[PDB]
Structure formats: structure tokens, C-alpha cells
Chain length 183, copies 8
């Protein structure tokens, strides 16, 4: 599952935390660690290099190395990862959620901001949101085209440790009104 | 659990659906049915009459029946329920979610919009967001004052049937891009 | 349809117009006259008194004459007409359009702005957009409750005069870019 | 008009639809098919190659093949078609509508977004909105310059299939409030 | 013409001013004094009490003294003046300008903000912008209805002193870039 | 200067703090405690009842008790204090600052939002922002009308403890970027 | 004065007009004709080629003809004219108005939008708004630098014919409410 | 501390001033002169070339002179200063303030607007806000990377003259409401 160091460090933060604002930072850090764990494991299953928040401009420079980085009109986005295969650019973002809400938002943004550069480079740019539902552990991938390339992806993992750390956090701060409504 | 008839109605809808948009509608309707199921069971545990989206003006008329409804300067919000006890008005919203995000949004809006009416009536107005985490089944209530009013509140239920209906929906529409990215 | 004198007024204006801005005001007046024509005929069919743009506050004073208009918290809208029967207030707006866009705008505005006053008065307020598609001439009415009151509505009319005058206007101003791209 | 198989696809969808959201997507697909049908026929009449939604950058690369598409400062629009003759770039958009509203929106956007690139290239860029009113079937074209090139444009078509299918849809969904008040 | 005190005081300010920001304040004060001079002279010709920036609420209380000032929903506008005759409320604003721009803005605002209260009181509210062109000295009045009541208004005045003071200001500060573009 | 028990609490908080977010809350609480200290001392000098954040509606009911709090159209603002003397309502806010910026923002808001209720009650409402510069200890009051009532105000007080507590805080967290740039 | 043919064209338009909107169009067109007449006469006095609304990119190409017009990052403004002298670019707009309002608006926009291009080209860009007051006939130029470049600039003209055309318009439409309040 | 000639000029300005608007300009100029004084002294301590408001584009051309200033996509910002050392670009702004508010606003803006140009040049860009608290004279710098380069910075300076000039100003204009509430 998750790294046993990372686990023990979360446990230490929970145990030493006394203030709602510190607790909320742990809550938020748990969610980002969970997303990143999924990303690393997903990339092992797809057999691709693990990346995080890649500047779009670096993606263009990798796929069309003729491009001049000083001038090219690249959108200001940092997707989790990408794959360029058979002259199709797949732009990948990882998500861990019980809902498709965050996926639709990322999708609409990435799709909209990549149209112009797709037309300039004459390269189709496919936006691929790869989401795992943390309760069912099912994978949901919007892109039919990406799924033809990878028709059977198995990411055999679970989120039980994140669940347990979160329950420990709420065990300790569950009657602090500031924590319960902290952004 | 949920009424057996509500269940079978959802099954028939899922079985007869063929389009992404109908499927997303079912998905949204399962979430509202789940919220309302939690509401009914919560209300039994609080020993209050089950209500849903009560016009604020009707609240005022119940608690101060001499008020002229044509003329009172009052907010236009529709909370799930309320409780008026010892001259304190508790405004209640039910939530089912694994995070606090929707709770903070409703709390901020309800709190901000009831300050003035609270001064005019000379009635303290406490905003009580009652959330159940559908995975852990833990109950989180922001308001210390409400929690002091009650003995330990236990709502011992699960959402397994909603989970199962959702899995059927995804077994049938899980490879439909329009569904996976539908709002 | 519209009476001869109205038709001839439009014919005269179209004949004398030489400028895009004048032509556009004619375009807009024709759509207005079409709407009001439908309204008159619709009301004959429903056997209700014809009205246009009634201030909401007058509606409330008609149905609840004891309300004080100086003090009531009530919305500022002016729907085409209304019907108060069996303690239900139906707020009616007429539309003539091949599309539902204008209906949705009016519906959302009126629905949203009447919720609070519905609660204050304890009178359900039903928003009824009665639209006629002027090509097909089918009537489209959103309100099921209203249609239970009036399940058989026939309005046997036509808009040929309005179509003919608009077609004549766009012909006369067909090489006037300013007119062709002018907004209301 | 549209070919049998297209007509029958719409008939099938309308027949199987039971939900407002499905019905609305049909409404919208019918308007799209009507637009594309006009576009195809219009282009036969003008004797130009039929196109739909051409990226502006491809237009520039067709007319000025030495431009570098990675570096040019150029707008991101996708007009229906274009014509480059006598060193004038005509940017064409097709419209089918009884109103000029949609034309004015497209016109203003394209005009405004193409001024700078017109200056950069030293090529006048003429925005041509070709609209057909589907009731009257008159053609309305804003551009005088374009009309000097094509003073005699005849597109002898009709939209009866589209009207009939829409009328059938609104009949089937005529007591569905959600459909009647649903937006695109 | 303008009061000879007021004149001499403007002249003193011009003569003592050394900074662009003080000068601009004189410019602005000249224009408001000119407007007010016109207002006073206009009111002599119409034979009505001179008023300036009347709270709308005071207007309602004068024409319908039954109204309760604590509750009535009065628009937040302060027109220069008003006349209530034959159950018509004329809301008057003075303008001195070579253009109708400021008139259209005031008209659109006053017209829009007075519709609801017109309907509540059942009193037509006519908005009357009375403008004098300071160069031709012609009077322009939008309201046909107001002009039937006052078919021949003569305001026999001129603005030569304001013109002269302004030219003196520009004589002194005409090469100060800060003054010339000061708001 | 400040209450000794209050000082001790602050010292303890600073000593036990280990996190930027906790430290920033101390920084904020120090600023509000300084504002409130100034307020108490100011109200002693002026011989007025000490208040803090009074809802406008309560001000109205105090000065005009015949008003119906359920119907009156009144602004929703919460100034620090007020003084009603000779049928003039002075609305008071305390400020502690080296700049007039916060004063202007409070002034502009209170002034604008009290014009209508001034008209409705026929009571002049004067906005009085009373600022002490915590370095020079000079008192600055915008309102000449208020200063005619109170021509010599001496609040002979000291903010050295607030300065010292703040310096302790900045010596523990002075190398924490999260703290230095915390909002 | 203005070309005799332009004059007679305006007369015919005024004589054949019957609608408020046509009349306002004439009014707007008289103002633009007046601006452009001032422009032509100003340019003769400055000894520069008459121009109107010059694309900024054409300016850059004239002054730096090696610049690649496809690629230069430049603002999209359309000033009335310009003068490039001793490596200083003077951006010129003509104004006819009795106040500075329209001048401040154009100056702020032109100044803000040319800062970046000025840095990139390494060319100072001075924004020169040249306004004639149509009543006093005085000439006001904001820019000291431009005024230092030139001998005293005299543009000795009047706008009497525009005044007379405007009076004819108002003799015919002065009692038409739609005209008086038309934008 | 500050240049003696500069001091004298300020004293003269304060003595000859009679108007709120002129006084407020002095107040502003005093604050900018204090900021610039701090800047000069700071740059002496750090042994860096004193600069003020450098356009970003000039920074780029200094550090990477092969870039084409006409084509490079670069932010339009004007930080106070910079340091390019070991292929790391430190963007510096000087602040004089008792609060971190202005620092956070400058930081957030510079950070956000330099991310893309960092990617394009492959040069890390660190945002360095250097604030001196004018009361405590303590120096606060957000950037740990910058402080690793410069572990001991002593700017041993004094703002007493600025404080004294400000007090003179507030003793001449302390009873002028227009001044006290001037922006
Ligand atoms: O949620 C995701 O799936 C992300 O990929 C998030 C991400 O990059 C991010 C960016 C800025 C702040 C926090 C998360
Ligand atoms: O999410 C909840 O907890 C609600 O209580 C939702 C609800 O009432 C609602 C109904 C219609 C529109 C928006 C919210
Ligand atoms: O379109 C309709 O159906 C109307 O009923 C329109 C109407 O009353 C109106 C009149 C003037 C301005 C805005 C709307
Ligand atoms: O309406 C038209 O005339 C279009 O040409 C529309 C069109 O291309 C389009 C397609 C998808 C989204 C927005 C516009
Ligand atoms: O221009 C007019 O005609 C006015 O009537 C103006 C007016 O009341 C006013 C209000 C606030 C500030 C300055 C002028
Ligand atoms: O700054 C002041 O002078 C205040 O009087 C502030 C105040 O009331 C307040 C209100 C809400 C939150 C925190 C402070
Ligand atoms: O007023 C001026 O001085 C102009 O120079 C105006 C002008 O060019 C213009 C043209 C079209 C739209 C907006 C302004
Ligand atoms: O406040 C600072 O720290 C500045 O560095 C400010 C600055 O550059 C500036 C820019 C424009 C106008 C006035 C000051
Ligand atoms: Mn990411
Ligand atoms: Mn992600
Ligand atoms: Mn609810
Ligand atoms: Mn709820
Ligand atoms: Mn109407
Ligand atoms: Mn209508
Ligand atoms: Mn298209
Ligand atoms: Mn099209
Ligand atoms: Mn006024
Ligand atoms: Mn006025
Ligand atoms: Mn306060
Ligand atoms: Mn305060
Ligand atoms: Mn121009
Ligand atoms: Mn100009
Ligand atoms: Mn600076
Ligand atoms: Mn600085």
C-alpha cells in the first residue's frame, strides 16, 4: 500500500497536532498523497514514466523538438502526465474521487485550452481523465481512444491506510467546530 | 434501508435507460434519494418532524405567528429543517458527503443571510449542518450548541443499496464517454 | 389578422423608410404587433379578459384587496396577463416564436421572482408561458396545471400579413449591411 | 433535402425518446443538420468547395503557405468556410434562422477578431454571413463586396423535413414541461 | 448674471492657486456653480421653489403624506426638483451641456428606478430633464407633457462670467500636463 | 497598558506555537486585542458606554424605540459604537493604524449605507472614524462636528506590549516563509 | 471652413430627415466631420501627412521596416496619427471638446497599452492628445515634450458651420422627445 | 539618514502647502522617498547595483542577450531589482511596512506571472520580497533560497526624519477632514 515511512510521518503529525488549522493541512496533505500514490501505481500498470504537473510547454518541446520555447503559444496548464503515440497527444490527469465533478472541470479546461495548439501543431490532442473510485476501486476513463490502446488496465491497490489516518484525524478533531468547517 | 418500492423504481429506470443523459439523471436522483433517506432517519433520531426545503418565511410564521408575512424583511433560503427551542432557532441542513466542502458552502450562505433577521427578531440563529460520511458512516455536526442540546445522536444506517444501484448504472454506462463526463 | 389600418400603417412606413435605423424599428414594431395580435386571439379562446403588461402589484391588489400596496414586499414584474381561480394564481405571458429561448428567459425570471411572494401570500403561483410557433401554428404551454383547466385550446389564426411585411422590408433593405446586421 | 437514411435516423430517435434530455439533443441535432444541409447546397450554388468549421490557422496556411503556424499571431476561430480571390479573404459562415441575432453575434466576433491579422498580413478580410430564412427561403448576405462577386445566388431548397420532424418531436413531448423549457 | 461675490471668490482662488489639483477643483466647482445658477434662474421662470438634490423619499412624503417613511420602498435618487400637478409627478433635473449625454444617463436611471414606486402609488411619474445649451442658450426639454403645462419658458441668462473664469484658469495652468489631464 | 492576564495568555500561545497558521492567528488576535484596548480607553476618555460591533438595528431601537424592528428598512452594518446627543446620531468606529486607508474604506461604506435611514428617521447621521497612530500615539478624527462636541480628547496610552509580543512572534517564526507570506 | 460640398450634403440630409434616429445619426456624423476637419487643419499646421485611425502595427512597420509583422507582440490601437522624430514616437489623437474627459480616457488607454511595446522596441512612446475647445477655440496639448519639439502651434479655425447645421437639426427635431434622448 | 537637500525640499513643500490635495501628494511622495531610501541602503548592504522599477523585458535581455525582444512571450511587470547568479534569477521588490499585506500582493502577482517565462527560459525564478518594518527596523525576507546566499544582512538605518516630516504635515492638516480622508 502506501509507503510505511509516509504513513508513520502522517501518524506523527496527527499525534502532535493541536489546532484546527494544522489538522486541516493534514487532511489536505492526505488527499494529495492519495492522488499521488494512485498516480505512481497507475503509471506502473501502464508502463510509463511517472510524472506530475508537467508544464505544457515541456510536453510540446518533447513531441515537436523543432519548436522554439521563447515564442510558441502554449496553454498554461500542468497536466499530471501525457503520452504521444502514433501522432496522437494524450494528455492525462489522475483523479481519486467517488464523483466525476473534478474530472469534468479538469476535462473542460484542458480540452478548451488545447484546441488552438492542436490546430497549430496539426496534432490531435486527446484529454484523458483517469479516475479511480476509492470505495469500489474501479477505474473510469473517459477516452475510448485511450482505452483501445490500453484495453485492460489493472491497478490492484487500496486506500485503507488513507482511510484509517483520516478516521484518526476526525477521532481527534471531530468536536472542533473550526476544523469541521475549515477550508 | 431505502423503501423497497423506491429501489425497484430505480432498477427499472436503469434497465430501460439507453442514453448518457438519462443515466446521469438517474445518478443525480440516486444522490438526492440518498440525502432524503438520511434526512428521514436523522429526523427520527432527533425526534423532529421530517421536512425538506422549508421556506424561511414559514419558519418565522411558525415560531412568531403574530409577524405579518406580507411585510417582514426576511431572507430567502430554503433549509432542510429547523428546531426552535428555548428561544434559539436552529437552522438544519442534511448532507451526505465524504468531505466538508458542500457543508462550508451552505453554512457560509445560511449564516450570512440570517444575521439580520436574527437581530430583528431578537432570536439567536444557529446554523447546523449535519453531515454523514457515506463510507465511514460517521456523523459530523459543526454546532457545539446543537450538540449540547441533544444526547449523543446516533443514526445507524448504511447506503449499500445506493452503492449497488450506482454499480449497476456504471456496469451499463461505464464505457460511455458522454456519461462519464456528464454534469 | 390585423386590421386594414394597422397593415397600411406598416406598408406606409416600409415604403417611406430609407434608413437602417428606421427599418429596424419597423422590424421590431411588427414583432410586437404579432405578439399582441396573438394575445388578443388567445384571450378570446380562453374566455379571459385581454390585458397587456399588468404590474404585479395590481395583480395582488385584485386578488387580495386588503393588502397595502405601499408596504407589501413584492416583485416588480409586468406579465402579459393572469388568472386567479380556485385560489391558484396563474401568471401568463404570451410568446410568438419558432424557439423556446425567449420563453425560458421569461419563465426563469418570473418563477424565481415569485417564490417569496407565493410563500408570503400562501397562494401557489403558477408560471404559464403560452407560446405559438408561427410557422406550424401549434400551441405550446409549459403548465400541466393550466392545461388541466384548459385541455382544449384552439386559436385559429395566422401570421401571413406579418410574414409578408417582414419579407417586403428585408427585400427593400437587402443591400443595406447596416440594416441586415442591426440589433433591436 | 436530407437523405432517407438521415431522415429515418431522426424518426427512430424521436420514436424511441422518452426523456426531455434526449428530446432536446434531437431538437439540437435537427438544427445542426438543417444548417449543414444549407451549407452543402449553398456551396454547390457558389461553386466552391464545401467545408465546415475550418481552423483559422489552416486558412492562413492555405493562402500564405510560407507563414510559420507555430509563430504567427492569429485568432482562434473556426468559420464555416472561406474564399480567397483577387487578394481578398472572405470568411464565410452559414446561418439558417428567421432572425439576424445569431448572425450579429458571429459577425461581431469574427470582425473584431480578424482586424489585427488583416493588418499583419496586409490582406483585407471580409466577413460574410450568409443566412437563409427557412420560412420565406430568401437569402440575406451582409457583404456588398461579396455580392459584387456573386450577384445572382439561387439556392432552390426546402426545409420541410426539418419542420415536420420538429413538429413531431414537440407533439410527442408537448406535455413534458421539462422538455418545453429545456435549453441547449 | 452670476453673483458678484461668488465671482470675486472664484477669481481669488484662481489667483492664489499654484497646483494642478487645486486648479482642477476650481474647474469642477465652476461647473457645479454654473449648473446651480441655471437651476435658480430656471425656477424663477417656472415660478417654483428652488430645490437641489431632493431625497426621493421626501418627495413621496410631500405628495402622499399618509406614507410611512420607515417602510416605503423609495428609490435612492436625489433629483434637482419636482412638481406634482393634476396627480402627475414630474421629476426634474437641471443640466447645462452642449450634449444630451448626461441627460440620457440621468433620464435612464431615474426612469428605471421610479417604475416600481409609480405602480405602487398609482401615480404616473414623468422624468423631465431640463437642459440649457450654454453656447446657444437654447432650452431643451424632453417631456412633451411638461411642455404643455409650461409652453413658453424663457430663461434669459448667460454664462459669460463662467466662461471668463475658466479661460483665466486655463491661461494660468494651460501648460501644466497634470492639470490638463486631471480627473 | 493591556490587562496582565491577557498578556500572559499571549506569551503562552507564542511559546507553545510551532506552526505558521497558528502563529498567524496569534498575529491577528494581537491586532484585534490592540483595537479593543484602544476602544476601551477611548470610551473612558470620551465618557461614553464602551461597546463593540453594535448592529445598526439595535442602534435604531435604542434611539427611536417606537420603530418596528421587523419592518424598518435599515442598513446591516455593525459599527463599533455610537453617540446620540441633541437628536444627532454619531456612528463611531475605532481604528489603530499608521495609515488612513482602513479609515477611508469604513467611512465610505458607513456614509453611503446610512443616507437613506437618515432621511427616513429625519435624524442627521455623522460618521466618525477615530484613529490612533500606534507609533506617534496621535489621535486623528475626521468629523469636525464630533470634535466641536469634544474639543480636547486625551487618550494617554501605550502599545509597547503589543509591539513586544509581535517581536517575540517574529523571532520564532521569522524564517518561516509560510508565516511571512500568510494571509 | 468645411468643404462646401460636405456642408450641402448635411443640409440635404437634414431637409429630407423625418425620424429621430436619422436625426441623431446626422448629429453624430456632424461631430465626426468636425473632428476630422480639425484633424486636417491641425495636420497642415504640424506639417504632417493627414491620417485617421492608423493601425499600430502599420506604425511599427513604417518606423522599423525590418520587424516581422506576423510575429511582433504589439498593441491593437488605432490612433489618429503619429510622428516619429529623433527616435521618439509621438502617438497623436485629435479631440474637439469643451472638456478634458474624452482626452483622459484616450490618454490612459494609449499610455497603458504602449508601455510594453516601448520597452521591446527601445523607443520612448509619448502619447499626445491634441484638443481644440470648440467654443473658445483654444488649443490644449498635454505633452510638454511634443510642445518643446514644435514652434508655437496655431490652428486658427472655427466651427460656425457645424454650429449652424446643428441649429437647423434642432429647429426641425427639437420638440421630438425621441431625438432629445437618443444615444 | 535621508539626503539633507531632499529633507529641505519636503519642509518647504509642507510650509507653503495650504490645500488638502497638495498635502496628500506630500504624504505620498514621503512614502515613496522612504521606500527608495531603503532600496539604496539595502543594495549597498547586499553589494548589488541599485535599480528601481526594471521592466521584465530588460531583465531578460540582460541575462539572456540572444533573445529577440520583439517576439519573446514575457510578463509585463516592473520589479524593483533583480539578481542573476548561478543561473538562478532572483526577482526583488523592496517594501517598507508594518504589515505583510503589500508583500503578499506583490509576491502572488510576481510568482504567478513568472512561471511561464521560467519554463520558457529553463531558468528558476525566485520571488524575493524584502521588507523592512519601519518601527522595529527588523528585516523580513520570504525567500530561504535568497537568505542561503545572504545569511547575514545588516541595513543599519533610520526613518526618523520621515516620521518627523509626516508629523509636521499632520499638525498643519490634522483638522482638515478632506485631508484626513484623502486617498
Ligand atoms: O486534483 C488533481 O487531480 C490534480 O492533478 C491536482 C493538481 O495538480 C493541483 C494543483 C495545484 C494545487 C493542488 C493540486
Ligand atoms: O444538497 C443539499 O443538502 C440540499 O439540501 C440540496 C437542496 O435542497 C437543493 C434543491 C434544489 C437546488 C439546489 C439545492
Ligand atoms: O416578449 C414578450 O412576450 C413580452 O411580453 C415582452 C414585453 O412585455 C416587453 C416590453 C418592453 C420591454 C421588455 C419586454
Ligand atoms: O451556428 C452556426 O452557424 C455555426 O456555424 C455553429 C458552429 O460551428 C458551432 C459548433 C459548435 C459550437 C459552437 C458553434
Ligand atoms: O449634473 C447634474 O445635473 C446634477 O444634478 C448633479 C448632481 O446632483 C451631483 C451629485 C453628486 C455629485 C456632483 C453632482
Ligand atoms: O477593523 C476595525 O476597525 C473593526 O471595527 C473591525 C471589525 O469589526 C471586524 C469585523 C469582522 C471581523 C473582524 C473584525
Ligand atoms: O473621438 C476621437 O477622437 C476619435 O479619434 C474617435 C475614433 O477614432 C473612433 C472610431 C470608431 C469607434 C470608436 C472611436
Ligand atoms: O510599493 C512598492 O513596493 C513599489 O515598488 C511600488 C512601485 O513600483 C510603484 C509603481 C507604480 C506607481 C507607484 C509605485
Ligand atoms: Mn496535478
Ligand atoms: Mn490529477
Ligand atoms: Mn435541501
Ligand atoms: Mn441538505
Ligand atoms: Mn409583455
Ligand atoms: Mn409576452
Ligand atoms: Mn460552423
Ligand atoms: Mn454557421
Ligand atoms: Mn443634482
Ligand atoms: Mn442636475
Ligand atoms: Mn468593529
Ligand atoms: Mn473598528
Ligand atoms: Mn480616431
Ligand atoms: Mn480623435
Ligand atoms: Mn517599485
Ligand atoms: Mn517596492
Amino acid at each position: 500500500g502506501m509507503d510505511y515511512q509516509e504513513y508513520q510521518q502522517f501518524l506523527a503529525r496527527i499525534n502532535t497536532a493541536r489546532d484546527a488549522c494544522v489538522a486541516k493541512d493534514i487532511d489536505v496533505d492526505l488527499l494529495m498523497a492519495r492522488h499521488d500514490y494512485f498516480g505512481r501505481e497507475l503509471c506502473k500498470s501502464l508502463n510509463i514514466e511517472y510524472r506530475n504537473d508537467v508544464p505544457f510547454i515541456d510536453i510540446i518541446l518533447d513531441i515537436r523538438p523543432e519548436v522554439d520555447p521563447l515564442t510558441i503559444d502554449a496553454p498554461h496548464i500542468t497536466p499530471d502526465n501525457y503520452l504521444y503515440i502514433n501522432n496522437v497527444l494524450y494528455i492525462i490527469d489522475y483523479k481519486v474521487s467517488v464523483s466525476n465533478e473534478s474530472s469534468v472541470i479538469t476535462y473542460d479546461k484542458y480540452y478548451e485550452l488545447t484546441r488552438d495548439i492542436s490546430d497549430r501543431l496539426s496534432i490531435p490532442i486527446e484529454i484523458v481523465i483517469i479516475r479511480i473510485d476509492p470505495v469500489s476501486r474501479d477505474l473510469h476513463i473517459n477516452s475510448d481512444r485511450f482505452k483501445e490502446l490500453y484495453p485492460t488496465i489493472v491497478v490492484d491497490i487500496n486506500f485503507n491506510q488513507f482511510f484509517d489516518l483520516k478516521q484518526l484525524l476526525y477521532e481527534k478533531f471531530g468536536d472542533d467546530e473550526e476544523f469541521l468547517l475549515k477550508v
